Amino acid sequence: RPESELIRQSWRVVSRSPLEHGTVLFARLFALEPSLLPLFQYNGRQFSSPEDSLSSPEFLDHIRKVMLVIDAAVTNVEDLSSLEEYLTSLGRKHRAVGVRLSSFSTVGESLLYMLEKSLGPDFTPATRTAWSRLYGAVVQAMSRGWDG
Numbered sequence: 001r002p003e004s005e006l007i008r009q010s011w012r013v014v015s016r017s018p019l020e021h022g023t024v025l026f027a028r029l030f031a032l033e034p035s036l037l038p039l040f041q042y043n044g045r046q047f048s049s050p051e052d053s054l055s056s057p058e059f060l061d062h063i064r065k066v067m068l069v070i071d072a073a074v075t076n077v078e079d080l081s082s083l084e085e086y087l088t089s090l091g092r093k094h095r096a097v098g099v100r101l102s103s104f105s106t107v108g109e110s111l112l113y114m115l116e117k118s119l120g121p122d123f124t125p126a127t128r129t130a131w132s133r134l135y136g137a138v139v140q141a142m143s144r145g146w147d148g
């Protein structure tokens with residue numbers, strides 16, 4: 001594909017400092033949907049403010065986990081059906097922790113925001129479109145974990 005290379009090339013810049021970049025993604029995420037903050041429950045406690053999450057080693061570990069699943073999608077960009085069962089089960093996990101499937105649309109916007117801000121003029125509309133397709137396929141797979 002042409003899109004496959006556009007994804008690989010755009011990811012390279014970001015994939016080298018995944019915590020820095022996933023930090024932008026999650027900052028944006030809570031700026032858009034602060035009601036996601038309480039779903040990150042470590043040691044029984046609730047983060048009061050978005051900046052509280054950034055001091056949590058467990059939260060930051062989660063950023064790294066997210067960037068690793070995205071990296072798996074990129075690796076597998078030419079065929080994502082091989083991640084389907086992994087992703088379905090990832091979906092069920094998130095259903096279990098209280099995430100509503102609709103919140104994954106905000107996550108997608110947050111990803112696109114992060115890529116836009118890292119790539120600047122290199123985030124062409126074809127790059128956006130390609131990422132939107134890839135993320136969309138990921139969430140389709142995950143959505144099976146919420147009962148189809």
Ligand code: HEM
Pocket residue numbers: 036039040041058061062065066067069070090093094097099103104107
């Ligand atoms: C609204 C967005 C999200 C919320 C509120 C959320 C919350 C959580 C929570 C509470 C856990 C369990 C605690 C932990 O391991 O940190 C978890 C695990 C995880 N999340 Fe997320 N998450 C979100 C989005 C994502 C996305 C977009 C990905 C990947 C693309 C992701 C990947 C993971 C992985 C890999 C784990 C470990 C799952 C396991 O135990 O096997 N999460 N998430």
